[PDB]
Amino acid sequence: TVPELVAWARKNDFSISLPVDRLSFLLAVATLNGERLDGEMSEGELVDAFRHVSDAFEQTSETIGVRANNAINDMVRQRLLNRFTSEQAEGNAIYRLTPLGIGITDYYIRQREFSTLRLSMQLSIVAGELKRAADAAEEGGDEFHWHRNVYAPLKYSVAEIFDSIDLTQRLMDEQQQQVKDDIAQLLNKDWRAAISSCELLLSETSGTLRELQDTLEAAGDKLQANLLRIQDATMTHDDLHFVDRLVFDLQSKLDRIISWGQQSIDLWIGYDRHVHKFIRTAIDMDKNRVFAQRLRQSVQTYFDEPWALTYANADRLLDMR
Amino acid sequence: VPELVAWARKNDFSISLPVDRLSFLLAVATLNGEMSEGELVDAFRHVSDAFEQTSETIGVRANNAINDMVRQRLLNRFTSEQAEGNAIYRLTPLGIGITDYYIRQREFSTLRLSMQLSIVAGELKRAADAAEEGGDEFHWHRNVYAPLKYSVAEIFDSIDLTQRLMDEQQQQVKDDIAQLLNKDWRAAISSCELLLSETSGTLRELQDTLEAAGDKLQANLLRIQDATMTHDDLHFVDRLVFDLQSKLDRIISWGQQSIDLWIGYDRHVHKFIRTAIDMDKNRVFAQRLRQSVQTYFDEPWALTYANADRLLDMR
Amino acid sequence: VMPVKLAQALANPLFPALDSALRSGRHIGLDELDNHAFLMDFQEYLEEFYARYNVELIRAPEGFFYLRPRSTTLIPRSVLSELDMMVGKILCYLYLSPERLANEGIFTQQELYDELLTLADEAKLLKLSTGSDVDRQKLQEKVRSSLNRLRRLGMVWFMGHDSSKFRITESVFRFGADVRAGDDPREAQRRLIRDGEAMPI
Amino acid sequence: MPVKLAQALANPLFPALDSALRSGRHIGLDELDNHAFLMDFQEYLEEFYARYNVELIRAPEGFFYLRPRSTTLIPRSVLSELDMMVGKILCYLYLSPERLANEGIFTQQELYDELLTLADEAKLLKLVNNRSTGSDVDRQKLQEKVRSSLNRLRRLGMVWFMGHDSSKFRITESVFRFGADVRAGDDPREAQRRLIRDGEAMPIEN
Amino acid sequence: VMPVKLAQALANPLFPALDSALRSGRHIGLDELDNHAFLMDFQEYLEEFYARYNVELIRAPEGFFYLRPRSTTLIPRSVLSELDMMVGKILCYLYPERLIFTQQELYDELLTLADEAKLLKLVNQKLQEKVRSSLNRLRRLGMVWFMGHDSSKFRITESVFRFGADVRAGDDPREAQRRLIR
Amino acid sequence: VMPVKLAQALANPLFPALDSALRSGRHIGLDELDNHAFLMDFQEYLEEFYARYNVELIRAPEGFFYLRPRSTTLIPRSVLSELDMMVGKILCYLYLSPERLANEGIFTQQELYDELLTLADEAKLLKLRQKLQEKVRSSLNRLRRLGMVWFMGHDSSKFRITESVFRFGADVRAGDDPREAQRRLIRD
């Protein structure tokens, strides 16, 4: 629903609170949980962990015990960590990052996958899975045939690879934002000097966003076509809806993805275009940033001797009521 | 590794999502199934209503929130002079992560898991029939590395997520039994025994479905490693194989440890129902013990006990 | 009788509205394609026309246009408040700051207000006299009040009357006149006052 | 001598178990071998300890412990009140369903917290020091004292310490003795009178 | 193209100022001999000029010129307060006129025919200022010439008749105006 | 199977208290007729019994019995303090003195105290003054529990020293002056 989800959330008190220190700690855990091979994490390891993170924020040493326990305690209520009583374990308990926990932590620690060969490769694989499912869908079969050779592949491999492609995009979205910042600071330090580097960072992401969109368009319809063949093989055996609604979302998500792919590009030209205007405006007419610099200092010294700009101001025309 | 804190502090990474904002983030993530600053403010408005508050600051607040969402990297902004609000918005990886957890459907189905395992088995076989055969980089990249990383490791990670959702489930039943027994005492026994049994079953099933598959998967993962370990160029096709084998093990292990632990809790609950409730059906003793604690000093007493003198030795 | 091109202009369909805008202190920037293109072609003749009221039609090095009323002006003249000046300056600052390039030209009343308090004695601003919120608010409203006047003067273009977002125009440079020619504040302001560009407070 | 007593006595388990019981340890199901051993020769070991004017007692909840009579040849002791207070809260935590998740494992902080909750903190501090009202330096002496009580109770077998440390511990059935003044539905101070007559307790005056 | 006699009006030295005065809402009477003859000479061609601004160059029947803006005006407009309006209706009827007036009379004549209730809402020495203010404006509108300095010892202009009621039946002046006042 | 005499021993009315006593570290000498006789009679078997606990039932050369626990003793162990040992060695020195034979083996807290200051380096004697005379009453009290001393009243004043003090004597060969060796022990 709409305001019903809001009650549900405040009915379960869903919340997340992770100040830098806490987040670092949660992050410190994932880092070690990642290198997991010996088994789960122990209360000993968690504190040993919280201990280093505490030293990182140059604070008291004795309070550790209680804070370490206070911390771990809400990491649990906030549904970020899970606790299990285990005598064998140092501290008599083991902790596991929750799904939510893996989520939040992954974003920060899990390395980012930025490759067109990746996408290409992904699309290929999806193409195969989608072809076979298409053929197999029309070649009919008992119930185990549909649930295993049509539905399943779509649902557990296709729907999965799309969600990844999508994620990669959102990831690519943060790189764009990242390049914008590089360009901002680059310019904020070398002024006219950076003009070269920026255009290169600019030129490079346009090429990237282009290769990606090509790939998606190149496979987009061969793919979309098969989802259709399947969407038809159901026209017949109507009462097989879970396989219809799946083909529907898979189609929507692909459109959703292909759509955005085009839009970002169009959006980048907006930024590019604007970055060129700026240079041509705040840098060219002030090649050594002398004006700008003095204008800033001008803001601090204004009160020592204030002045005001003049402007024409004709008397309005007074009229009756 | 403590560099992590340095880096974390520099970029000042933080997440602050009181139930207040979270609804917003959810409401947003809900509707997202692009977004303009326009539609994004509407959303925040509907949430503002649910908390019956002021409208005088709605405008200023809604924008104040959206910025928070932008500084905490939950939301990504895109200036679009033509969209309503002159801006477009997209949930980020962190944004989708956090929201799926609160909206994605459960997946504790045994059939689901077998289908996943069946699908994985096939790919892991195909990659073995091929990686055994051989070919150019494209063969090993498109017919070995590609299915192991974009399809197999992906399905494993999904199975890993099902177990964690199962850990969550596990906690829930534990909390529920605490509540059930603490409120209806003897009357909640039959209910509690049922929740203990239902959970043990689920666990036992997923794990049994997993173990039954393990051995074969591990087998083909071993074929792919037998061709890759020789050649000094196909390394990348090995740090993956080794990586998946290692992950398949971590899953089969925790599946087991999870059941051990559960069996323990189950035993504990039963022992408790025997010691604390069957021997105090009317729940009087606990009340009395408690009263005896506060009223103890009124007329203090103490237990006796054997206390033989220890053997006083030399030196 | 009259110089040919003086008439071609005074008769052009764009004039009455433009004239009315110019006499009200508006600065005609490049965003006003037609009007700007117009003033460009009849610059000299409209120069003749406005002179007749003792007003200099002026084109700045940045290309914008505005009237600069002389002492003996037939059209009254005014001066911005100290807060106005301050806002205008922040606007000019934001206009030359690369740290905002992601905005693509569209700023917020919030980004403005923060930038202001970031670069100016919050104390002295409140000088329009303590730290009371009944005074704090009065600043944010006055700021907005100033932002709207500059909107009427052409320094800024609101992205919706209701909206709290806006675009900045080249006209904000007038706010940096006291720094165009490297010098001493008391000196520059001496030339700005002599030229009719500025006034004392 | 009965054949079976000689058997019990020749068993490799007896000596250390015997020392334990003489030092006041209570033996519950947790000590698998010893408890199995006692159940086996209960009747005979009963007679043996009787020679010391001591009763080998198996409580209704099943644990064993020696209860010296007043003519005992094995020295008797009496817990302090702080001990009884801690003992009673131990038994309390053991019956608390709101704790089941702990599977019986608890922490010094958990014990201490639950103690201040149900007990008269005011007088609780008086045990530590004659006249002390909140003196934060005394709450520390109270904490250390509660800590010492847990330790003494470990020795008596009321609790098991979890690891190389003393911070966490598991509770035992033997902790039911602390609720003896109420187990038998009666007049709390009537049961106490009965407990005193049986050598289970001694009244604490001042 | 542009009407020749229009440029001739435009080029005339008197324009710049008149133009600014007209656009201000100032009424041009007989007093301003040179201008008023200018607005007579080219009335029609200037009638066209200001039309480009969606303003009409009216000439009240009494002979005085003024610019009346349309809803569609291209010249910024301002509307006098209801108080200013009540002070104009009085300044009319006061115009036994063959005497220069005083803030006194205007203040008296006001508190007289002005409702002792509604006249107190225009100020919801309390009104002795909003009156010296209104009059300050009306002077700039060309309907009162300050004779002295800044003092309130003025002289009424015929332009005020724009505040006069409608003598249509053909009755008497002063009460027709007096009536409207009430 | 347990020997017939072991049982008979544990069945003796004297066993229970003696057993408790022996486990506390008490030394059973001759000024305790009934018990001592008892141990002389069943030494062979009680020897085996106590061995089960990893404790050796020992008869010293001077005749008294006592349990000496091993490192693996299954019986709770305690330990005398340096002052307790010091006092014991001094009690031995006294027993060795010639006066002892003409006092029915009876001495005084003061005498003990005197001899204590005289031989033990008065500096290290502080390691653990009218207090040090009361603290010596403690050591002398535990030592009484151990069977080294017998009190001539409920108080402390004067006491009787038994042959079990040799547990504190020095290794002596035939011909070695016991007193010189004893104070050499007390001294090093």
Q: What is the dihedral angle through the alpha carbons of F25, F26, F27, F28, rounded to the nearest 10 degrees?
A: -140
Could you give the CA distance from residue F176 to residue B215 in angstroms, rounded to a whole number? 82
Q: Which chain A residue has its CA at the smallest distance from B101's CA?
A: A100
What's the DSSP call for residue E99?
-
Closest chain B C-alpha to A261 CA, distance in angstroms:
11
* Ramachandran category for residue D115: left, alpha or beta (phi over 0 → left; psi -120 to 50 → alpha): alpha
The amino acid at C16: P
Out of D123, D185, D203, closest to residue B301 by CB: D203
- Rounded to 10 degrees, what is the CA torsion of D162, D168, D172, D175? 150
Is A125 part of any domain? Answer: yes
Q: Which amino acid is at D91?
A: C
Give partners of A (≥3 CB pairs < 8 A): B, C, D, E
**Interchain pair B315, F146: CB under 8 A:** no
Give yes or no for a contact between C121 and A301, defined as CB atoms under 8 angstroms apart: no
- Kindly report the nearest CA distance between residue B306 and chain F, in angstroms: 12
DSSP structure class, residue A148: I
E58 - beta bridge partners? Answer: E66
The token pair at A4 is: 């019903």
Interface contact C165-B63, CB threshold 8 A? no
Stretch (H or E) spanning C118: helix C109-119
**Alpha helices in chain E, H assignment, sequence order:** 4-11, 15-22, 33-41, 43-49, 82-93, 103-113, 130-140, 173-181
D60 → chain B, closest CA residue: B279
Size of interface A-E (CB pairs under 8 A): 49
Of B4, B94, B158, the CB nearest to A31: B4
Question: Are B197 and B274 found together in one domain?
Answer: yes
Contacts of A48 in chain B (CB under 8 A): none
Cβ-contact B99, A103 below 8 angstroms:
no
Is the domain of B177 the same as that of B39?
A: no
A223 token code pair = 């793919």
Cβ neighbours around F127 below 10 Å, total: 12
Nearest-Cα residue of chain D relative to residue F72 = D16
Q: Are B118 and A148 in contact (CB under 8 A)?
A: yes
| Residue B9 touches partner A, C-beta closer than 8 Å | yes
Tell me if B188 sits within 8 A of B156, measured CB to CB. Answer: no
Those residues whose C-beta lies under 8 Å from the C-beta of residue B98, and which sit 6 or more positions away, are A16, A100, A103, A104, B17, B25, B74
The alpha carbon of B116 is separated from its chain's Cα centroid by a whole number of angstroms, namely: 19
Q: B27–A108: do the CB atoms touch at under 8 Å? A: no
CATH of the domain at A302: 1.20.58.590
State the CATH number of the domain containing residue B57. 1.10.10.10
Burial class (CB in 10 A: 0-12, 13-18, 19+), F33: exposed
DSSP-derived secondary structure for F22-91: HHHT--B-SSSHHHHHHHHHHHHHHHHHHHTTTEEEEE-TTS-EEEEE-TT-SS-EEE--HHHHHHHHHH
Where on the phi/psi map is residue A250: left (φ > 0), alpha (ψ -120 to 50), or beta? Answer: alpha
Give backbone dihedrals phi and psi of A276, rounded to 5 degrees, phi first: -70, -35
Whether chain D has a CB inside 8 Å of the CB on F2: the answer is yes
Give chain F positions within 8 Å (CB) of D23. 76
Enumerate the residues of chain A whose CB falls inside 8 A of the CB of residue E164: none
Interchain contact, A313 vs C25, CB within 8 Å: yes
Yes or no: say if D201 and D177 are a contact pair by the CB < 8 Å rule.
Answer: no
Judged by CB atoms within 8 Å, which residues 62-121 of D form the interface with B? 65-68, 74-81, 83-85, 87-89, 91-92, 94-101, 103-104, 118-120
Contact between chains at F16 and D75 (C-beta distance less than 8 A): no
Chain D residues closer than 8 Å to B279 by CB: 61
For chain F, after which residues does the C atom lie more than 2.5 Å from the next written residue's N, i.e. where is it broken? 128
Phi, psi dihedrals of residue C126, rounded to the nearest 5°: -60, -10
Of C168, C153, C150, C174, give the one whose Cα is nearest residue C108: C168
Report phi then psi at F73, rounded to 5. -55, 130
What CA–CA distance (Å, rounded) separates A176 from A271?
10
Q: Letter for the amino acid at B107? A: E
C108 CA: distance to closest CA in chain A (Å): 17
Contact present, F59 and F178 (Cβ < 8 Å): no
Q: Chain E 75-134, CB below 8 Å of chain C: which residues?
A: 75-76
Interface test with A, best of E77, E92, E159, E163 (most A CBs within 10 A): E77
Neighbouring residues of F130: CB distance < 8 A, sequence distance ≥ 6:
none
Q: Which residues pair with F66 in a beta bridge?
A: F58
- Domain match, A108 and A171 both: no
Touch criterion met for C and A (3+ Cβ pairs within 8 Å): yes
Q: Do chains A and F touch (3 or more CB pairs under 8 A)?
A: no
Residues in chain A: 321
B98 and B111 fall within a common domain: no
E1 touches C: beta carbon within 8 Å: yes
Residue showing tokens 């051990």 = B260
Q: Identify whether residues A137 and A147 lie together within a single domain.
A: yes
Q: What is the DSSP letter of A316?
A: P
Give CB contacts under 8 A, 24+ apart, made by C51-56: C52/E15, C52/E16, C53/E16, C53/E20, C55/A312, C56/C196
By the CB < 8 Å criterion, does C132 face chain B?
no
Contacts of E68 in chain A (CB under 8 A): 319
Is residue B185 within 8 Å of B273, Cβ to Cβ? Answer: no
**Does residue B114 sit in the same domain as residue B262?**
yes
Please tell me whether residues A76 and A193 are part of one structural domain.
Answer: no
Domain boundary among B40, B74, B106: B106
Query: Which of C7, C52, C75 lies closest to E2 in CB terms?
Result: C7
Q: Tell me, yes or no, whether A118 and A106 share the same domain.
A: no
- Please indicate the experimental technique that yielded this structure: X-ray
Angstrom distance (rounded) from CA A15 to CA A28? 21
Residue B136 lies in a domain: yes
Rounded CA-CA distance D143/D77 in Å is 23
Q: Is residue A316 part of a domain?
A: no
CB A263 within 8 A of CB B74: no
Residues A84 and A215 in one domain: no
Interface of B with A in 224-263 (CB under 8 A): 246, 250, 253-254, 257, 261
* Residue pair A39/B257 in contact by the 8 Å Cβ criterion: yes
Residue A275: closest C-alpha in chain C = C101
Structure token pair of residue B114: 């077998």
Domain membership of residue A318 (yes or no) is no
Residue A297 lies in a domain: yes
Provide the resolution (angstroms): 2.9
F25: number of CA atoms within 13 Å, CB side?
Answer: 21
d(CA D8, CA D24): 20
Lookup result for tokens 């920037």: C29
CA F6 to CA F8: how far, in whole Å? 5
Q: Which of A112, A130, A164 is the last residue of a domain?
A: A112
**Pair (B154, B276) in one structural domain:** yes
CA gap A234, A246 in Å, rounded: 12
d(CA B43, CA B38): 9
- Whether the CB of C11 is below 8 Å from some CB of chain B: the reply is no
The arrangement of strands across the sheet holding D159-161 comes to D105-107, D168-171, D159-161
Record: contact B22-A37, CB cut-off 8 A: no
Number of independent structural domains in chain A: 2
Answer whether B288 sits within 8 Å of D92, measured CB to CB. no
- Asked if residue B305 is part of any domain, the answer here is no
Alpha-carbon distance of F14 to F18, in angstroms, equals 6
| Residue A92: partners with Cβ closer than 8 Å, 6 or more residues away | A43, A85, A86, D105, D162, D163, D168
Q: Are B210 and B118 in contact (CB under 8 A)?
A: no
Count of alpha carbons within 13 Å of A86, Cβ hemisphere only? 22
CB contact E52 to C (< 8 Å): yes
**CA distances (Å), B169 to each of B108, B165, B203, B259, B267, in order?**
10, 6, 10, 13, 18
Question: CB–CB of D98 and B288 under 8 A?
Answer: no
**Is residue A98 within 8 Å of residue A82, measured between CB atoms?**
yes
Residue B22 touches partner A, C-beta closer than 8 Å: yes
Query: How many beta-carbon pairs under 8 angstroms link B with D?
Result: 154
Provide the strand spans (E) within chain B: 15-17, 35-36, 75-79, 87-91, 301-306, 311-313
For residue A77, the surrounding DSSP H or E stretch is helix A64-77
CA pair distance E127, E122, nearest whole angstrom: 8
Neighbours of B182 (CB within 10 A): 15
B124: exposed, middle or buried (Cβ count in 10 Å: 0-12, 13-18, 19+): buried
Chain D touches chain B, with at least 3 Cβ pairs below 8 Å, answer yes
What residue numbers bound the domain in which A131 lies?
A: 113-307
Domain final residue pick, B106, B138, B172: B106
Q: How many CA atoms lie within 13 A of B104 on its CB side?
A: 17
**Chain E residue numbers touching C17 (CB-CB < 8 A):** 74
Do the Cβ atoms of D162 and A69 come within 8 Å?
Answer: no
Give the number of C-alpha atoms closer than 13 A to the C-alpha of residue A62, restricted to the C-beta side: 0
Structure tokens at B54: 């002021």
Domains and CATH numbers, chain C: 1-70 (1.10.10.2250), 80-183 (no CATH)
Tally of CB atoms within 10 A around B288: 17
Cα dihedral D141, D147, D152, D154 in deg (nearest 10): 180
Cα dihedral: F12, F14, F17, F21 (round 10): -110
Residue pair D50/D5 in contact by the 8 Å Cβ criterion: no
CB B156 within 8 A of CB B247: yes
User: Quick one: B52 and B118 in the same domain?
Assistant: no
Distances (CA, A) of E99 to A304, B85, E63, E149, E156: 57, 66, 22, 20, 11
Bridging pattern class, strands A41-42 and A93-97: antiparallel
Q: A119 and A227, same structural domain?
A: yes
Q: Mark whether F and E touch (3+ CB pairs within 8 Å).
A: no
Q: Please give the Cα distance from A152 to A143 (Å, whole number).
A: 12
Q: Considering only alpha carbons, which residue of chain A is nearest residue B256?
A: A39
Q: Is B302 helix (H, G, I), strand (E, B) or coil?
A: strand
Cα–Cα distance between E148 and F174 in angstroms, integer? 149
B311 found inside a domain? no
Would B306 be classed as within a structural domain? no
- Cβ within 8 Å, pair A298-C189: no
Cα–Cα distance measured from residue A82 to residue B163, given in angstroms and rounded to the nearest whole number:
12
Q: Between A15, A124, A129, which is nearest B17 by CB?
A: A15
Nearest to B286 among D67, D79, D95 (CB): D95
- Which amino acid is residue D114, in one-letter code? E
